[PDB]
Amino acid sequence: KVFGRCELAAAMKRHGLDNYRGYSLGNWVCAAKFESNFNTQATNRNTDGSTDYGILQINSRWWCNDGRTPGSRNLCNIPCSALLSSDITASVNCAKKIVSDGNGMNAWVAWRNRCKGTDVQAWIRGCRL
Ligand SMILES: [Cl-]
Ligand SMILES: [Cl-]
Ligand SMILES: [Cl-]
């Protein structure tokens, strides 16, 4: 599913991501924009052989099981395929664990490089929330 900007903001809020660990909704929408362009089915293969999955490009080295990432963990206790669903529940719940892991949203290098320090509220501007 490719979400609309406000549609995704609303779904993220519904699932308790708004201001989670102090990160406003615009941060999460911005991260999703640059990680996946709002496409739940986004996948990308990393140089280390791990893969990133879903709207927030969650990585199989630590967070989910895909059966093809040697020496990896599955800390969210989910198949990576669950992160591709039109229903963002699994992605949101896993993101909550990731952002609580110590480095906040810096876990998403694209958030650090493209969202951090910017006017992230622009991502939810105009949205009925
Ligand atoms: Cl915001
Ligand atoms: Cl594996
Ligand atoms: Cl980047």
Curated annotation (Swiss-Prot):
Q: Where does substrate bind?
A: D101
Q: What CDD domains does the entry give?
A: LYZ_C (cd16897)
Report the catalytic activity. Answer: Hydrolysis of (1->4)-beta-linkages between N-acetylmuramic acid and N-acetyl-D-glucosamine residues in a peptidoglycan and between N-acetyl-D-glucosamine residues in chitodextrins
Where the protein is mainly located, per its record? secreted
Could you tell me which SMART domains the record lists for this protein?
LYZ1
Q: Keyword Metal-binding, does the record have it?
A: no
Listed GO molecular functions?
beta-N-acetylglucosaminidase activity; identical protein binding; lysozyme activity
The misc remark on file is:
Lysozyme C is capable of both hydrolysis and transglycosylation; it also shows a slight esterase activity. It acts rapidly on both peptide-substituted and unsubstituted peptidoglycan, and slowly on chitin oligosaccharides.
Q: What is this protein called?
A: Lysozyme C
Origin organism is Gallus gallus
